[PDB]
């Protein structure tokens, strides 16, 4: 992880995070279904409705929320050791 709030923040609600969805996460899954949560017997077709809200919500990139809620760049790299012929090995040097 590192700090990216100074350059990423201007706010920019392009990277909106899903809040309403069917259930919790399972390993190795992608959350791309932009489907409105169904919390009632009545189907949610027909845009917004009572007790059925779109998962999209603001996630505080406004400049007012400076110290908090500003974007921090975090990346996680999966590493596999002794499973396949290694392709990424570290530097040696010396000549």
């Amino acid at each position, epitope marked *: 992880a590192w700090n990216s709030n100074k350059l990423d923040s201007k706010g920019n609600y392009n990277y909106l995070y899903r*809040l*309403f969805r069917k259930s919790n996460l399972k390993p190795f899954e992608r959350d791309i279904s932009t489907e409105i*949560y*169904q*919390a*009632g017997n009545k189907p949610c077709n027909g845009v917004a409705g*009572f*007790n059925c*809200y779109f998962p999209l*919500k603001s996630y505080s990139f406004r400049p007012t929320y400076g110290v908090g809620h500003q974007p921090y760049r975090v990346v996680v790299l999966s590493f596999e050791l002794l499973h396949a012929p290694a392709t990424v090995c570290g530097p040696k040097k010396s000549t």
Partner: nanobody
Amino acid sequence: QVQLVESGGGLVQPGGSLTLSCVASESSLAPYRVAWFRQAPGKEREGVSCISRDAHPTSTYYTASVKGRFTMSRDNAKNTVYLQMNSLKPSDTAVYYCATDLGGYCSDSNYPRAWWGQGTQVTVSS
């Protein structure tokens, strides 16, 4: 399908305290968020407090008028949530309702509103 019951309201003096309860029956409120609403006659229903399924302070939301005075706590075994009032004002005099949905987490402006109880009358006067 779940039904709720609000009770504990009554005639209290200004500066007093009250403790409401939203009893749920026939269903479990553990994986679902619960919100408290009040509606005095003459004005539209407004949010008061919102507790989530995890009952975490981050997921715990109160409205501006009740910050620092109103507190909730949900007991999952009995399937009930409270709305503890501290230092009640006459402006708080309203019919308090509790509502829940299939959602599990509240927001600053996202409160469950599906199944409402009969409500309880909280009166703050001499």
